[PDB]
Nucleic acid binder design. Structure first.
Length: 191
RNA sequence: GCACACCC
């Protein structure tokens, strides 16, 4: 080594084994609403984390050009139901999406870069039928974010019921897509 | 009166 005058450092406070196998997605709410979504000193938003039993966080602008702040929901689908159900209700609170309109709030879910291409389907038919099952608007971009992050986003537009069902289904195929690592069809499939 | 927090 080399003894540098007061040039000694380290600081390694990264302990504990917290299993991050909870579903974590980014809920798209523009800066015009995100503020009041947190609510009063940010107390009841953390209270929400308690009664939902999930990790409710507000993501700082992932891009400096964002007019929106995404809610980082880390929780089981049981909790996500309340969390996102009430988050869409916060849209209703100020009626940003539309006064008479039913809730139309975008949710952004992070999928592996190639997995977004495969949610379209191995034949390309799957993305169309996904919309038919999810009851939501699933738009899969060819760009979104460079594969430098090996991960992109699909945008879900519609009602929270639809969004919640869409999110979990696309997030669900991700695991099955990654199963390609096995590489070896030691069995059949009806496809 | 509406926002800020979310970990050590």
């Amino acid at each position: 080594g080399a003894m540098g005058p007061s040039s000694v450092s380290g600081a390694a406070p990264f302990s504990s084994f917290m299993p991050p196998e909870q579903e974590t997605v980014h809920v798209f709410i523009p800066a015009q609403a995100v503020g009041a979504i947190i609510g009063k000193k940010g107390q009841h938003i953390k209270q929400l984390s308690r009664f939902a039993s999930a990790s409710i966080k507000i993501a700082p602008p992932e891009t400096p050009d964002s007019k929106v702040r995404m809610v980082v929901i880390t929780g089981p689908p049981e909790a996500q139901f309340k969390a996102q159900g009430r988050i869409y209700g916060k849209l209703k609170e100020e009626n940003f999406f539309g006064p008479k309109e039913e809730v139309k709030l975008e949710t952004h879910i992070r999928v592996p870069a190639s997995a977004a291409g495969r949610v379209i389907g191995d034949d390309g038919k799957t993305v169309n039928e996904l919309q038919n099952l999810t009851a939501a608007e699933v738009v899969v971009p060819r760009d979104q974010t460079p594969d430098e992050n090996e991960q992109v986003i699909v945008k879900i537009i519609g009602h929270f019921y639809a969004s919640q069902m869409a999110q979990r289904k696309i997030r669900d195929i991700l695991a099955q897509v990654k199963q390609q690592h096995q590489k070896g069809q030691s069995g059949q499939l009806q496809a």
